[PDB]
Every structure is written in C-alpha cells, then in structure tokens.
Amino acid sequence: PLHVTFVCTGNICRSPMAEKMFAQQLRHRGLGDAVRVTSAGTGNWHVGSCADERAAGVLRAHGYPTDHRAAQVGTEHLAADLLVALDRNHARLLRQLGVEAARVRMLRSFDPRSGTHALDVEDPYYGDHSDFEEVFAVIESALPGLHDWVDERLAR
Ligand SMILES: [Cl-]
C-alpha cells in the first residue's frame, strides 16, 4: 500500500488538516484501500494530543473528519513513499534526517499554480479562526497535484 505522510512541527494544526483532507478525498475516489495517509510532527510537545480545536473546527466546517492523535516523526513515517513537508523548515529537517530529495516535497509544490519555488503553508496556531480557514484553503488548493502523484504511483 502506497504511503503518503504530511509533516509539520507539532502535528496538531497544519499536517493533520492536510492528512484528514487528503485521506477523505481519496475515499471519495475509491482509492482509500490503495493509499495509506498519515502525518507526524518534527517535535514531540504534543504526542498523543488531538488536533487543535480550531483545526477540527475548520475541517468540520468543510465536511471533513477530525479524529486525530498527534505523533512525532518516527520509523513508520520516514518509511513512507512520500514525505510532504508543510513548510521549508520541515523539508530541510527531513532532508537532513536522511530522506533523499525525491521523497521530500513541500505541499504547495503540488498546487497547479506552483513555480519552481514552493511556498510555505503558514502555521495558524497563534492566529484566529480566519487564519485556520486560510490554511484550509491553501491546502485545498495544493492537494490536486498530490492526487496526480498518486495516480502515477498506482500505475506502478
Ligand atoms: Cl506546526
């Protein structure tokens, strides 16, 4: 089973949002059994915690699932077929951890409007509900390219 994992720092806002969203989208496409989707954080200050109440709030506001258990990047995640970094800091950490460039890609590099320079997804933790809605929109705009990536991989 193909494995894609999203990575941010605390695994309570950005990455879990991308995880639930992409996983649900795959289910709608009937590809839920063929692709495993998870997420983790580079840090461990939230291991075991649910997603941020505001993150679950926006997910729910758009009809997506919210169940989540925060975790720090481990063996399981580093063994994914693709590690999706939320921002450039996450990417350099995963890179420096030993993951080759081809397996570390920033989420926004999948946005159809993306240029060679991939943009960061901002952390909404210290913002307001508006910031969480914006993070949702940014992620929503980037995922279509990840679906193409999955289609290419499943062909294998
Ligand atoms: Cl974070």
Q: What is the DSSP letter of 84?
A: E
Two tokens, residue 89: 């800091």
123-127 long-range Cβ contacts below 8 angstroms, 24+ apart = 123/8, 123/9, 123/13, 123/14, 123/86, 123/87, 124/13, 124/14, 124/54, 124/55, 125/10, 125/12, 125/13, 125/52
Give bridge partners of residue 41 from the DSSP assignment.
8, 72
Quick one: resolution in A?
1.9
Distance 148 CA to ligand 1 centre (A): 26
For strands 82-85 and 35-41, give the pairing: unpaired
Distance 115 CA to ligand 1 centre (A): 24
Separation between Cα atoms, residue 153 and residue 147, nearest integer Å: 10
Which among 6, 82, 13 is positioned nearest to 46, based on CA atoms? 13
Residue 48, exposed/middle/buried by CB under 10 A (0-12, 13-18, 19+)? exposed
Domain extent for 142: 1-156
CB 106 within 8 A of CB 15: no
Distance 124 CA to ligand 1 centre (A): 8
Two tokens, residue 83: 């590690």
Distance 14 CA to ligand 1 centre (A): 6
Largest Cα span, the chain = 43
DSSP for 16-61, written as a single string: HHHHHHHHHHHHHTT-TTTEEEEEEESS-TTTT----HHHHHHHHH
Two tokens, residue 10: 């605390």
Count the domains in the chain: 1
**16 Cβ contact partners less than 8 Å away, ≥ 6 residues apart:** 6, 39, 51, 55, 68, 70
Within the chain, how many helices (H) and strands (E) appear? 5, 4
Enzyme catalytic residues? 8, 14, 123
**64 Cβ contact partners less than 8 Å away, ≥ 6 residues apart:** 20, 21, 24
Which among 147, 5, 139, 123 is positioned nearest to 64, based on CA atoms? 139
Strand order in the sheet with 82-85: 35-41, 2-8, 82-85, 104-106
Separation between Cα atoms, residue 69 and residue 12, nearest integer Å: 8
CATH code, domain with 139: 3.40.50.2300
Q: Which residues surround ligand 1, an ion (CB under 5 A)?
A: 8-10, 123
